[PDB]
Symmetry: D2
Subunit: 221 residues, 4 copies
């Protein structure tokens, strides 16, 4: 019943809402974080996920406590500490992709052996951004989608799915921001978590290489 779930970047914001939703549903939830005191209720591993050896030890620790990760949620969104000019910020965007590659590659090893797995990558929450900021956003998301689709092709018929959830504006002047959202409101973080939970369930077993926008119509056209 209860699964071993890992949410990287699950200490705050949408990452935390996702982590809580899995724990509230009865899964065994671990998270990674860089700094601060982590939220209550989780196996929390302080580490830099850009570092192969730190990721190895994180997974060691998680596998020894919860068993091998069956569901990986890689929250690749821009964190607090990170969010500098937009131009220099692309270096932060690159560090988020690199960490994602490493945690996913490490999780795939055990999922391959189990002949079952769920990998869900979460792009950054949308904010108001200049041209270079919008480029960095587009690059970050396409990187996730490109990675997910490649892994789906590479892994083939091993019952491991790879999907991306793309949040829009999320509630964490308000009228001026929502004026570009057809639904005319901010998302609640729980709305993002519900989609993540759906993709991680047996009901989504035939969905792979997909990007699911949870954005109120914002980016549809």
């Amino acid at each position: 019943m209860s699964r071993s779930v890992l949410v990287t970047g699950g200490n705050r914001g949408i990452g935390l809402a996702i982590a809580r939703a899995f724990a509230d549903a009865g899964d065994k939830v671990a998270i990674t974080y860089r700094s601060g005191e982590p939220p209550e209720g989780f196996l929390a591993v302080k580490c830099d996920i850009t570092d192969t050896e730190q990721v190895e030890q994180a997974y060691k620790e998680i596998e020894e406590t919860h068993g091998p990760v069956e569901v990986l949620i890689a929250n690749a969104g821009v964190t607090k500490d990170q969010l500098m000019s937009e131009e220099d910020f692309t270096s932060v965007v690159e560090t988020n992709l690199t960490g994602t590659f490493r945690v996913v590659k490490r999780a795939n090893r055990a999922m391959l052996r189990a002949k079952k797995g769920r990998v869900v990558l979460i792009s950054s929450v949308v904010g108001l951004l200049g041209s270079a900021g919008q480029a960095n956003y587009a690059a970050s998301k396409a990187g996730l989608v490109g990675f997910a689709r490649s892994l789906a092709r590479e892994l083939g018929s091993r019952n491991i799915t790879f999907n991306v959830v793309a949040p829009g504006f999320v509630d964490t002047q308000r009228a001026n921001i929502v004026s570009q959202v057809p639904l005319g409101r901010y998302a609640r973080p729980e709305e993002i978590a519900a989609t993540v939970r759906f993709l991680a369930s047996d009901d989504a077993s035939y969905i792979t290489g997909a990007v699911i926008p949870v954005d109120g119509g914002l980016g549809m056209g």
Copy 2:
């Protein structure tokens, strides 16, 4: 608790599977169908949804019994009976869009008054097609996606969502057809239904203008 649900094209295949999933979930489910026999257990109206008068009469009958439609599932996929050269088949593509336009426009009246609604459009199951075949498939699916996105923008902030579920290959020589599907198998119709049920749920309230492929990674790249 139970909602008034309408599935157009709901007497067989994916449409029937969708109707059953909402019935199992405790909703009041009506279907329309063009030909054949109705499934047992459902309020069923035989009609040609390309005819505005027949559409109004089907809705009148259904809603007298179940109340105004709160969830509309327009199964626009090519039907058994339709399944001609491709050049002539463009007329069937035309009529499939026409029918979808008529049933959705009718449903939007009550949904707008209720300030809530769910409209999910289902594209055709994928087949092996030549060039004009693939063109007609691309035209049919894009018509649905364009319709859903335009409606999302037009209805704006009235809590009515419009989404498209795009099935891949669905089980309704086999190993040769599914050699192009990364997950290496056909979808069960119930898998399509599970996604439709999720989109119709309150958990998917912020998803609109979206196309969700349930295709095992077939059309991703």
Copy 3:
């Protein structure tokens, strides 16, 4: 030096502008047209390109005079005379695709034998449209793009390219229509023609399956 060029729908507007650009460049240019008067200076065949026999006869006549068609420009855009409710207009969308399928399939015979060809499909000029209107537009354009890509894959390495030019707003109240165009003006028809001429040139030999928007940034995002 001079090639045999055919522009279907080439008696007015963008189609005429395209025919003139190839004529100015020194090509032997034929056109087909459904109704109206033919432009002076061109081999012109009055015919209904949805009728296989009429298409064969138009090509027979044209090629006797100019030699086998080496460049086909299929102007599939909604015509003056076509320009109905949107529900009925889906039949015009159907016939516009049908005509395009017939003229291209006919051209491919000689191009395959020659091991060289250029096929450029032109989508409809953009207008202000409601929901089903936008759907029909999206369906028409996607049909062309799907056709071109399928043909590129099917013909493979025979040096025949298939591309789509997608005009935005074209000059054939004004300030209100072009307030959504980032460049802030209408296209001149000659601007559409210049892109078509480039795609037909030997300089565009490696471009195939592409959709090139000439739209002032209108449909980009």
Copy 4:
């Protein structure tokens, strides 16, 4: 007649083919490079384009010799020196975006004053890549496209266009590589340069925010 053109990364490969094509056409061509002896025929400025102050001086030097840049070609493709594991390589991908932002922002200042300009961004040549490599590729391209589209919207009706050229495989085992290319061959670098020249010409004045794939059908679907 003769324009001031700058090709960043124009010292080798496709960048050099583009630079030569503009110089052969009679334009005044400057290039930036990091190391090595630059090719003959160009005003060549050794600099790190990730550095705002080095970019400022580069442009100073170019503007004093050739006059303000009227055409900027930003070759954001992965260079020699750069092309490490795919995972660590995303840092290189981020440095390429940052340099692009800076050179474009600097060129926009003079183009805005001239009320005319051409900005063309060139994505990486395609190679055979693992999952993390394909993600890095997708991120790099989407970053360029996202930047171009944002600038097109931001600049509005100032007659400055922003476009992306996406090369496929370019000629700089061969049968196994080309087996995924519909046209069944590598591009010649001159084919990429010809498209760049077209976008930079007055004939492409209504094309902006567009991505033009020069890939033989490779990435069309």
